[PDB]
Amino acid sequence: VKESKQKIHVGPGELDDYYGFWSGGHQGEVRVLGVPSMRELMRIPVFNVDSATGWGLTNESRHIMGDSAKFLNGDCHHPHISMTDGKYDGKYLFINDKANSRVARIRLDIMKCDKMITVPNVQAIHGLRLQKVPHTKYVFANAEFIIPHPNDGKVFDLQDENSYTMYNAIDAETMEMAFQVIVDGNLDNTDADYTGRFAAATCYNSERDWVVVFDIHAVEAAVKAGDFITLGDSKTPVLDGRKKDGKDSKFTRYVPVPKNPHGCNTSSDGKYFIAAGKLSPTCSMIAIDKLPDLFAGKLADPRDVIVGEPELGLGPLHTTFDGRGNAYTTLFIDSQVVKWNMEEAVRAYKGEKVNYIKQKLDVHYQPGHLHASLCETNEADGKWLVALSKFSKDRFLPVGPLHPENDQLIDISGDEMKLVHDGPTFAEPHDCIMARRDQIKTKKIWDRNDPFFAPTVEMAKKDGINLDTDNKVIRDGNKVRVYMTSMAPAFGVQEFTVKQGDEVTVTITNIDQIEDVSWGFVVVNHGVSMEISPQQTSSITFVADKPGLHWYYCSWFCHALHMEMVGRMMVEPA
Amino acid sequence: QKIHVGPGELDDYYGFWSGGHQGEVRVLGVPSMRELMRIPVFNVDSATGWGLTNESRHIMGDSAKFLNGDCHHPHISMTDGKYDGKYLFINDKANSRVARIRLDIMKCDKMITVPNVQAIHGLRLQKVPHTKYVFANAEFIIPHPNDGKVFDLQDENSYTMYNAIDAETMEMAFQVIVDGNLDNTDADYTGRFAAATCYNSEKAFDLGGMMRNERDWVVVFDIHAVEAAVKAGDFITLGDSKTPVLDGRKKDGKDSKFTRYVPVPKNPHGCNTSSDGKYFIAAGKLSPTCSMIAIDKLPDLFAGKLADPRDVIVGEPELGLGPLHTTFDGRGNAYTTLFIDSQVVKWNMEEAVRAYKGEKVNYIKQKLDVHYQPGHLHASLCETNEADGKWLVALSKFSKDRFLPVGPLHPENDQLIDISGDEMKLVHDGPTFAEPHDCIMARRDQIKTKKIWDRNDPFFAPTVEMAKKDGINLDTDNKVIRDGNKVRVYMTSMAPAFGVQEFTVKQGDEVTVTITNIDQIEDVSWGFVVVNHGVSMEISPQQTSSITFVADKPGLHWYYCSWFCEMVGRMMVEPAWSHPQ
């Protein structure tokens, strides 16, 4: 007998035990929470435009975003942390954008998005998860929607032979495409095994849909051999993982699974891909150690890799793991989390009369994703569970027609799940991920060599500027490039003069060394705003389209004399 | 007092937090300090489409071109010196705006760019007889006209102005030219007087210059005299703005009808009306004091019955290093942030005034350490004559080691403090993003929200009129209206499907999609995203929302329901080469 009795209060001066990384949902950002307090410590802009830091306005952010900087929106769902040997290594966080078909990488040492890619020749990146073993070499990303190839407006027919969607592999370290695998059907969610050979995804188009399993080794072998095509103007190797006249691809196997299956979750012992049944009141358990036989043609029926199909309740959507042998599954219709024992389910599937269900806990209301601490790793610790519920109804004060999501913290450390905290959140975060405090190591101040602003350092070099010291205004036709340091009471350049119509770039290097002393820069009535934290260089470009005197000021309260940290841009009329 | 709000319990107060440099307003529950909602205002919100939709860009006007704001000062409208829960107003220092939020729908419903000024900072509301005016400070001195011929702040036509906005119409009411500049502002409990601190009586542009004078001032406005001159036509106008402009500067040492200047040290910052209506209290900042202005001495001051403007000061308590802001428990105590000493100091106002008269008395009751460098602070109901003395939030700018490390950028630390007793007790550290400067609390029963939109709501009434020109009944119609290279899609939305599940256009067509959520259930919000076109918006129950974008890519393009949602559809774009060149 072990009780669930962890402390959930983090009082003043006490620190949280875990980091939580929440998807920002339809709002487009990533959020850092402290767990168990469930307080938001930081917002990391990704696909949104952030007025505060200037993400989406600065030259450094728009460089990372590339052409997709033209979009002001994103739709995030699935945040995941890079792994080495099946354990979080604290290097990167990755997240999808369903709205504009992107994957972004966040560097966890600076807590900023440092790379972003628009996945070519697909629409809507939804499902996303990382290779676990030997490390996160690939980011695996589902493109949800079937589209014509090419999508040039000659063919709109979605049953055309060249209409399909694809499974996507991004090189985690370079954030370039690795390869794409054409599949049958629509892709929903995906996960990876604990060896690197296999990955799997639920599919909902084309009484039984499937989980498609990928032999990533076979895909890799084909790419190395050059046995691939390319699509349109993308150099990405494209492999064909569809069935042809009933004949399987080398790259894929289609495992029949009921019914419009949704969640696709790898157990922390590495034994199972568990697909949540959604319309079927079941989960289906695929034995990963039977997949080699499946691909080698030693099994009579792709159904032979199914070793469990527990009946759990109405509307199973997602599954997580406590590392003790239990799975935890959201029941969307019954509005519960059900705790069940995986090996007992496997024995039940063979016909033994054993109850594998341990507990059903009511949640409020209509849970979608759920996440137990370290569940994506072989160190799953069985301490905390968050269930992310879509309808909060009366659980919080009314706030008008739009309601928050209810993210409920549940103590799973003992035999009985216990609901301990209701956390309201904005714009349907949908899913989250937790890490131990000691798995995350952050920088206190920036490195002057940081790649995040290395292109700005390069630009300064071409102008002969030492960013650590210089306060200079460079004139170049109708372009004006202001460079300044900022510290203690004043901007290093307190006034400058331009001509109406000039394109002004302001680059600021914060040379304060004290942690937490962030600077800001706002140009009044010009739509210009950005952050410059200690030892960072930030830059922003705008046109001086209004004659006269225009004030700029430091936005980030950094000193008793904050109100007075200002400068003047004087714009001479045309 | 209950500190922790368990599952199934509700908060006792609403808190409305400024979004700081991030530009939104945030709704929190107090005392849990959890964020219940975000209200987009000056930011572009991917989730609801604020800043992308036609309804939101119509409210923002020309300023819809800006993707940023910088807000500090949220305030709730009042009737007879008590919150009435109708509106929240807030400033934008970055692009010189004031915005109004309707507290029944929890959305920004009006926005104004204040003409002929730069940087709206200080903002507060008339209390009595109700919030007729929104008072807003423009912080920075600029030339008039600001056409690029004169840049000198010492020119006789370089100045800044105090701004009054009609709260109900969200049009300018008047502007008062002042000497110096403007920082924070508050209003009395009669409707006659408003007051603002000034830190730049020097009209300088550099740090040393702004600190030269031993005293700047709080400028006091006789609003009755301003209104009297407006109705008498005794005003001018600047540029193309019709806003009445009154001159509240001194001439050759002679006071204007509209203003008086009370010398106060030094670069004073906070300007806070006591809840009993007795004082404007200016926080001394560079001076380790607050200056207490007796509001009942102001009529005599404006009537020339006092010899020296300092005669309206009846207290100047020495409190500590860097006083910035003051709030009130309704028990006769004031609470002031000490930015340098990093404390909140509780002090008794009537004893501070006695000490000013020389009566040696210790008016300081407690100094509580906060973490670290507090700016604003706010006690529950402090801006009303119902100040209840229960909760206090101090908003500190350096959180240092109070939270887990999250990289070089740190959160702010908004600390909840129990003040219901004689001893202040720190109960909760609340990390927040992007520097909320200030917040405002309301009792749960002071706020009444709608669960479902009204079909005649002015928020989308222009969209209803557009639909009418097309012969469209929005509650029923699922139709595609073609008009040259414009395509206007109108659909209803309710489970199980979009009312229009596919439509075809020509490459380059300008497509407007208008969706009416005809579902009646509450919490059933719909969303709409067009993949790879940067298009996203919310449609809540009985709302009509619309968004306009160019179909610049040939081929098939999926759209889907984001919120609460298969619920998908297809836009088919015929290639330009198959249509007239």
Ligand code: CUZ
């Ligand atoms: Cu803008 S200032 Cu003390 Cu209000 Cu923060």
Ligand code: CUA
């Ligand atoms: Cu930066 Cu004050």
Ligand SMILES: [Ca+2]
């Ligand atoms: Ca001064």
Ligand SMILES: [Cl-]
């Ligand atoms: Cl999943």
Ligand SMILES: [Cl-]
């Ligand atoms: Cl257990």
Ligand SMILES: [Cl-]
């Ligand atoms: Cl104030």
Ligand SMILES: [K+]
């Ligand atoms: K800060």
Ligand code: NA
């Ligand atoms: Na990129």
Ligand code: NA
């Ligand atoms: Na307006």
Ligand SMILES: [Zn+2]
């Ligand atoms: Zn999901």
Ligand SMILES: [Zn+2]
């Ligand atoms: Zn899901």
